[PDB]
């Protein structure tokens, strides 16, 4: 039966089996096999697995003793495959409209609509945007928008931190670039997101060789693999920073990165929805006016709205009061915002 011949192939397999990289097809079914250290006898292949699945120079299943080619490889999994491949569409498409409302449309019709409906480009002959940078003040919504398009997705979403690629072994970074874009290739049209790559410029590290000539090579592999060859087709890639100065302009140049999208701090019309929805789930003495908080602070982030709208509940619930007086918003905003440069030292502005 097939269990007997299958067990015979299993007995061709000697239980310590190794994993080694091919170099070249030697066409007459005896091959020559590199290990990680490359001890390469003229070994043969177990001739029931398909030899013609693999290109030359691809990893296989081997033996220790005779080193004979036994089986086919499956994948490569690192601590990054767990993190690069996002498992679920996590959460938070939006809990509050009124965050930005401007570049929401821009990321929507720039990223979502060419992806979700790629038939407009037939009508007009337009290429899709390949690289878009999302950058500005810290904690604007950029990471939150990455989790938005992560949740409101249509693709195999990929989440990458830019500092994941930093190793001490030689070539290890570009190897994880190759596994990286292999992941970016072989699922479906996937949304790659890469964040905090403004912290790859003036950066020197401990677990490292010669610093100026290590990550130059890895980022060089990013420049070659990212938007050089290997036909983009439909592979969405979105990166994000906070600053711009350490950016090598060789990737900033078009072809590679197409759209550079800033982020302002929100205006008072959009503030009211963030103030309101951050207060949508709390007991509040509604006689107080949020418009003092909406008017007063001029360059708030939404974390300032968050911190005040939690902090006033820390001041009312500090004394077991379910609803919040206006002076708890006073101590709230004066507790959040510190070192208000108004008078004292110079205050030349008066």
Ligand X SMILES: Nc1ncnc2c1ncn2[C@@H]1O[C@H](COP(=O)(O)OP(=O)(O)OP(=O)(O)O)[C@@H](O)[C@H]1O
CB of 137 to ligand X, least distance (A): 7
User: Phi and psi (nearest 5°) for 200?
Assistant: -125, -5
Token digits for 54? 């693999």
Residues 6+ apart with CB under 8 A from 8: none
* Exposed e or buried b per residue across 340-349, where buried means at least 16 C-beta atoms within 10 angstroms of its C-beta: eeeeeeeeee
| Contact pick of 151, 301, 325, 326 for ligand X (by CB under 6 A) | 301
Binding segment for other proteins (CB under 8 A), chosen from 18-26, 42-50, 97-105, 165-173, is 18-26
Query: What number of residues does the chain have?
Result: 350
Determine the size of the site formed for ligand X (CB under 6 A). 18
Residue closer to other proteins (CB basis): 225 or 301: 301
From residue 58, give the alpha-carbon distance in Å to each of 34, 40, 74, 97. 10, 14, 11, 49
Which single residue is written with the structure tokens 């091959």? Answer: 31
Burial of 136 (0-12, 13-18, 19+ CB in 10 A): buried
Binding to ligand X (CB under 6 A): which residues in 90-149?
96, 98-100, 138-144
* Interface stretch with other proteins, choices 10-18, 46-54, 213-221, 272-280 (CB under 8 A): 10-18
Residue closest to ligand X when measured from CB atoms: 302
Span interacting with other proteins, options 205-213, 272-280, 290-298, 304-312, rule CB under 8 A: 304-312
202 labelled ligand-binding: no
Q: Which of 249, 302, 231 is nearest to 273 (CA)?
A: 302
In angstroms, the CA 3 to CA 10 distance is 10
Quick one: how far is CA 290 from the chain centroid? Answer: 36
Choices 23-31, 95-103, 174-182, 295-303 (CB under 8 A): range interacting with other proteins: 295-303
> Binding site annotation covers 233?
no
231 to 290, contacts with ligand X by CB under 6 A? 242, 266, 270, 274
Q: Is 306 in the site for other proteins (CB under 8 A)?
A: yes
Answer yes or no: are the C-beta atoms of 179 and 78 closer than 8 Å: yes
Q: Which positions lie near other proteins, rule CB under 8 A? A: 10, 15-20, 35-36, 61, 71, 74, 77, 117-119, 122, 138-139, 154, 188, 301-304, 306-307, 336, 338
Q: Annotated binding site for ATP, which residues?
A: 136-143
Q: Which positions lie near ligand X, rule CB under 6 A? A: 96, 98-100, 138-144, 242, 266, 270, 274, 301-303
């Amino acid at each position: 039966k097939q269990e007997e011949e299958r067990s015979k192939v299993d007995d061709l397999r000697g239980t310590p089996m190794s994993v080694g990289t091919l170099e070249e097809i030697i066409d007459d079914n005896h091959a020559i096999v590199s290990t990680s250290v490359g001890s390469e006898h003229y070994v043969s292949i177990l001739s029931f697995v398909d030899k013609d699945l693999l290109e030359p120079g691809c990893s296989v299943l081997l033996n220790h003793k005779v080193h004979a080619v036994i089986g086919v490889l499956m994948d490569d999994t690192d601590p990054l495959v767990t993190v690069m491949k996002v498992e679920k569409a996590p959460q938070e498409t939006y809990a509050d409209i009124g965050g930005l409302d401007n570049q929401i449309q821009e990321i929507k019709e720039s990223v979502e609509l060419p992806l979700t409906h790629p038939e407009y480009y037939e009508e007009m002959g337009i290429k899709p945007p390949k690289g878009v940078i999302l950058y500005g003040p810290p904690g604007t919504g950029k990471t939150l928008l990455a989790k938005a398009v992560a949740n409101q997705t249509s693709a195999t979403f990929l989440r990458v931190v830019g500092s994941e690629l930093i190793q001490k072994y030689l070539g290890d970074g570009p190897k994880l670039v190759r596994e990286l874009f292999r992941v970016a290739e072989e699922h479906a049209p996937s949304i790659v997101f890469i964040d905090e790559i403004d912290a790859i410029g003036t950066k020197r590290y401990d677990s490292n060789s010669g610093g100026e000539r290590e990550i130059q090579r890895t980022m060089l592999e990013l420049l070659n693999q990212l938007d050089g060859f290997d036909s983009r087709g439909d592979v969405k890639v979105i990166m994000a920073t906070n600053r711009i100065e350490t950016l090598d302009p060789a990737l900033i140049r078009p072809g590679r990165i197409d759209r550079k999208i800033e982020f302002p701090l929100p205006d008072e019309k959009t503030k009211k929805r963030i103030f309101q929805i951050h207060t949508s789930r709390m007991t509040l003495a509604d006689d107080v006016t949020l418009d003092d908080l909406i008017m007063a602070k001029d360059d708030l982030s939404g974390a300032d709205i968050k911190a005040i709208c939690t902090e006033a509940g820390l001041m009312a619930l500090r004394e077991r009061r379910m609803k919040v007086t206006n002076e708890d918003f006073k101590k709230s905003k004066e507790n959040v915002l510190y070192k208000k440069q108004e008078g004292t030292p110079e205050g030349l502005y008066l």
